[PDB]
């Protein structure tokens, strides 16, 4: 299953997964491809923030689905 | 007994202030 | 490092005094068990 992850900068990144895959596995794929720690990624689909405990078979996702990624920005 | 006495003094403790931490942890 | 004076039980809020600062309501960190934290002993505390 191919999916599309967009981002706030316009970067687009395709990815291949299977609906048995758990969300943290997806964040691990993002980490290894991009180089970003799993803590810092936050994921949005259709306006709901996704959660680790669930497969992509949950949230009834289909292929060619447009996810969004947002960074854990902080300051101090 | 009239008084023309004197005395010592203790200090003022309140002097500390907070400062910005500058830890560098990745 | 500071001390604790009144441990709320079954209520996760703790009270601490720096003995030079004021008293704050605080809690535990992620890795420390909430059992071996008997009230009335010295503890280490984060600055932030």
């Amino acid at each position: 299953m191919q999916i599309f992850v967009k981002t706030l900068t316009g970067k687009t990144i395709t990815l291949e997964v299977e609906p048995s895959d758990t969300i943290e596995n997806v964040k691990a794929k993002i980490q290894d491809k991009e180089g970003i720690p799993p803590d810092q990624q936050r994921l949005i689909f259709a306006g709901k923030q996704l959660e680790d405990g669930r497969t992509l078979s949950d949230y009834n996702i289909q292929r060619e689905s447009t996810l969004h990624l947002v960074l854990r920005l902080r300051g101090g | 007994q009239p008084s023309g006495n004197t005395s010592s003094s203790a200090l003022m403790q309140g002097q500390r202030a907070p400062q910005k931490p500058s830890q560098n942890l990745v | 490092c500071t001390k604790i004076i009144n441990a709320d039980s079954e209520d996760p809020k703790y009270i601490i005094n720096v003995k030079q600062f004021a008293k704050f309501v605080v809690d535990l960190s992620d890795q420390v068990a909430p059992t071996d934290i008997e009230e009335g002993m010295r503890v280490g505390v984060d600055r932030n």
């Binding site: - | 309140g14 | 004076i5 009144n6 709320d8 809020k13 009270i15 600062f21 004021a22 008293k23 704050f24 309501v25 605080v26 809690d27």
Partner: protein, 126 residues
């Protein structure tokens, strides 16, 4: 939505403080245990009619807005609050002062149990 907005601002770190005075023009003067004094024109997340002088309160560090009333008893220091034992003296241990213990029993022990005898006699005990 509004409840969600208010949930975040109630962070854990608070500062214990005492309201010295209260005025309507709803406004309060707080001394806080860091030994600081601040006026404020609005009390915040507690019922202004519920607040009263001398109440302990927990306050935000930077803004001194009230966040919790902290009515839970955390006052003073533990003293006299031992339940370890009722005292152990017996009147047989006392010499001579029999009249004083009699007057004392009259002055306290009977009122502590017979208030109704006073009420229906029409008198107020000491």
């Amino acid at each position: 939505e509004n409840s969600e907005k208010i949930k975040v601002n109630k962070t854990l770190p608070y500062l214990v403080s005492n309201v010295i005075e209260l005025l309507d023009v709803k406004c309060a003067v707080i001394k806080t245990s860091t030994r600081q004094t601040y006026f404020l024109p609005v009390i915040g997340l507690v019922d202004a009619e519920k607040l009263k002088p001398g109440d302990l309160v927990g306050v935000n560090k930077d803004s001194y807005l009230i966040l919790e009333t902290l009515p839970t008893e955390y006052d003073s220091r533990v003293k006299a609050m031992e339940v370890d034992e009722r005292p152990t003296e017996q009147y047989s241990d006392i010499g001579g002062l029999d009249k004083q213990i009699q007057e004392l029993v009259e002055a306290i022990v009977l009122p502590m149990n017979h208030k109704e005898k006073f009420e229906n006699l029409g008198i107020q005990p000491p």
